Amino acid sequence: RDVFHEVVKTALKKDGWQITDDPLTISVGGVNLKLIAAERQGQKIAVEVKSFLKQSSAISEFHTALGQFINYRGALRKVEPDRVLYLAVPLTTYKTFFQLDFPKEIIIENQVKMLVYDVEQEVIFQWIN
Amino acid sequence: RDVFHEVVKTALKKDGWQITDDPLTISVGGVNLKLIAAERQGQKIAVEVKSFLKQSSAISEFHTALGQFINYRGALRKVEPDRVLYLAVPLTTYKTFFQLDFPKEIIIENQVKMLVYDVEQEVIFQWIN
Ligand SMILES: [Cl-]
Ligand SMILES: [Cl-]
């Protein structure tokens, strides 16, 4: 987990993003919810890092990742509404699991913004807004 | 898990619901996603059972429950669109965690329908549509 977290931080910095908080902690509405907070030229983001390791089903990993995304997005609206949340996904996962019809559709239905990163090279491949 | 599953089945049957599948299996769009399928007077439902045990944070349990709910709901639309999905929550959880401002708001923002059940008495307390 720490490794993939560091890969995404590296990929962000290579594109000129400034890491401002890690973890970004969010407390709201009676609940305390490691997200990466970053910014570039005043544009603020939060990144939910996932590795989608073969150790568990991609679908089980997706359930938790999706729920986290919706909760974090909902919380951020009411705490830091200018900070946009992205789900960070490895390119390999993006090209396989996320090209299957169902996950692709759920992501779109739920406006799940994504940061697709190449793990080996530690770079940002694509932002999906 | 099996215990709470049986409690909800018991609660459903006491209210005249006929259990038709357990587990209700859902395969769609390249993914194979124990939901309870039940019906009464032609009205069809699917129930996602959660116990919200103190072993883990309620928020962590909620992330996974929410993601599962959204995925199952989205899959059911495209497979069995007349079967309405409910998140089954214990009354104790309902009166505590789900009365906190944040979870309450996320549930409403996401149309998370609920079946609130009393665990000790094994009855359905409230349907939240
Ligand atoms: Cl990759
Ligand atoms: Cl209860």
Side-chain angles (χ1 to χ4, degrees), chain A residues 3-26 28-33 35-53 55-103 105-129, chain B residues 3-33 35-53 56-129:
Chain A
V3 169
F4 288 83
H5 186 95
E6 288 306 306
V7 167
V8 176
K9 289 170 67 168
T10 291
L12 285 162
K13 287 182 286 176
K14 284 185 185 170
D15 277 17
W17 292 85
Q18 175 189 356
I19 311 299
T20 59
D21 275 317
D22 181 8
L24 172 61
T25 54
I26 310 171
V28 67
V31 179
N32 285 335
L33 292 81
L35 287 175
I36 300 169
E39 65 179 72
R40 193 176 69 162
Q41 207 173 28
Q43 312 316 126
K44 294 178 181 172
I45 70 174
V47 182
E48 172 186 339
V49 182
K50 299 291 173 174
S51 56
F52 281 92
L53 295 179
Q55 285 63 305
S56 291
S57 61
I59 187 62
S60 66
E61 293 160 347
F62 184 52
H63 293 317
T64 298
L66 182 57
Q68 289 170 338
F69 183 90
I70 293 173
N71 279 327
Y72 299 150
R73 178 178 60 192
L76 286 166
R77 285 185 196 153
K78 304 288 186 283
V79 179
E80 199 174 10
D82 291 307
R83 184 176 305 282
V84 180
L85 182 67
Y86 293 81
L87 174 67
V89 183
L91 183 52
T92 58
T93 310
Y94 180 68
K95 294 176 75 172
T96 56
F97 181 73
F98 289 104
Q99 301 310 309
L100 296 170
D101 289 347
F102 173 78
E105 176 69 18
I106 292 295
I107 285 290
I108 300 160
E109 291 182 4
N110 290 278
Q111 305 80 39
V112 182
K113 297 180 180 285
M114 299 184 282
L115 183 181
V116 184
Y117 66 101
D118 185 290
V119 173
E120 182 174 13
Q121 295 308 318
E122 313 194 41
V123 296
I124 298 186
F125 169 61
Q126 185 178 352
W127 292 99
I128 303 169
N129 277 292
Chain B
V3 169
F4 287 83
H5 185 96
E6 288 307 306
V7 166
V8 175
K9 288 170 67 169
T10 291
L12 283 163
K13 287 182 288 173
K14 284 185 186 171
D15 276 16
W17 292 84
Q18 174 189 357
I19 309 301
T20 60
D21 275 320
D22 183 7
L24 172 62
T25 54
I26 311 170
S27 289
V28 66
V31 178
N32 174 201
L33 293 81
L35 286 175
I36 300 168
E39 66 178 74
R40 192 176 69 162
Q41 207 173 28
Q43 311 316 126
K44 293 177 182 172
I45 68 173
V47 182
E48 173 187 340
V49 182
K50 298 293 172 170
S51 55
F52 283 91
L53 295 180
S56 291
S57 61
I59 186 62
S60 64
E61 294 162 346
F62 184 52
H63 294 314
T64 299
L66 180 60
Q68 290 167 339
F69 182 91
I70 293 173
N71 279 147
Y72 300 149
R73 178 175 63 189
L76 286 167
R77 282 186 198 152
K78 304 289 185 284
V79 180
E80 199 174 13
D82 292 307
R83 184 176 304 284
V84 180
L85 184 66
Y86 291 82
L87 176 67
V89 183
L91 185 49
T92 58
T93 310
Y94 181 68
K95 294 175 75 171
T96 58
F97 181 73
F98 290 103
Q99 299 311 308
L100 296 171
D101 288 348
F102 174 78
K104 177 183 287 291
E105 176 69 18
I106 291 297
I107 287 290
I108 298 164
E109 293 181 3
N110 290 279
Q111 305 80 38
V112 183
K113 297 179 181 283
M114 298 184 282
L115 182 181
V116 184
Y117 66 102
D118 185 291
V119 171
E120 182 175 13
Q121 296 309 318
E122 314 195 41
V123 296
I124 299 186
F125 170 60
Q126 185 176 355
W127 293 99
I128 304 169
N129 276 292

